[PDB]
A and B are shown apart, each in its own frame.
Chain A
Amino acid sequence: DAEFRHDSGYE
């Protein structure tokens, strides 16, 4: 519930 999936560096 705590974090979003993303590629490193995404702004």
Chain B
Amino acid sequence: VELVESGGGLVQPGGSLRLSCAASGFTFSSYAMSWVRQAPGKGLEWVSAINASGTRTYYADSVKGRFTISRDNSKNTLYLQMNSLRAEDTAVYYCARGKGYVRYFDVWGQGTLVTVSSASTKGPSVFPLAPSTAALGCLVKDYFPEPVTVSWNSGALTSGVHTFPAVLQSSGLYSLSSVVTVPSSSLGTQTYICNVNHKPSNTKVDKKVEPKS
């Protein structure tokens, strides 16, 4: 029993986007469905719902007249057509299966991130935070939209790693740091590489961070 969403990405305000949710492992046509969203750092908000047959749809006041929920039972797929998108529609969108009238949601998708912004897709610049236990890191600056991933030594280094939540700068671009604390004794012997991946711009960078000359 699974729900797999897709279709998320970046769109400009006033824009349109269609999300899909592919259902497997159960009789899709038997179940009422819903979309639920969660703005970054905020709570769950119901968006829209549809009965099993697709004959009746339901909308939250925030999205009524802008969003259309639909399903294709012959394709085990649920849709959400989002039109006239606004900055406050930015969120992870989840599809959820109704279970019993529907009494609760029992199965959820993995979620798909929708960002609504006028800012253009841009890959990060990656700068070293050189070690002066020692701390070192990478500054991942000036990218858009979320998200970026950071690992160290291609995943081999996890102990003492802290990758901070991104902050939106006044410039409208995100920036974050990833740091690691390591034994002072290892500096200049052990190689430390931060692996940065900004999938929205297909930007990947491996940056060696070393003590400054």
Contact = CB atoms under 8 A, between A and B. Distances in A.
B58 A2 contact: no
Contacts of A3: 32, 51-52, 56, 101-102
Interface string A1-11: 11111100011
Contacts of B49: 4
Interface string B41-64: 000000001011100101100001
Contact of A1 (B58, B59, B64, B100): B100
B-side interface mostly: loop
Contact of B64 (A2, A4, A5, A11): A11
B163 to A, nearest CB: 40
Interface residues of B, number: 16
Interface in B27-82: 30-32, 49, 51-53, 56, 58-59, 64
A2 B59 contact: no
A6 B101 CA distance: 10
Interface of A: 1-6, 10-11
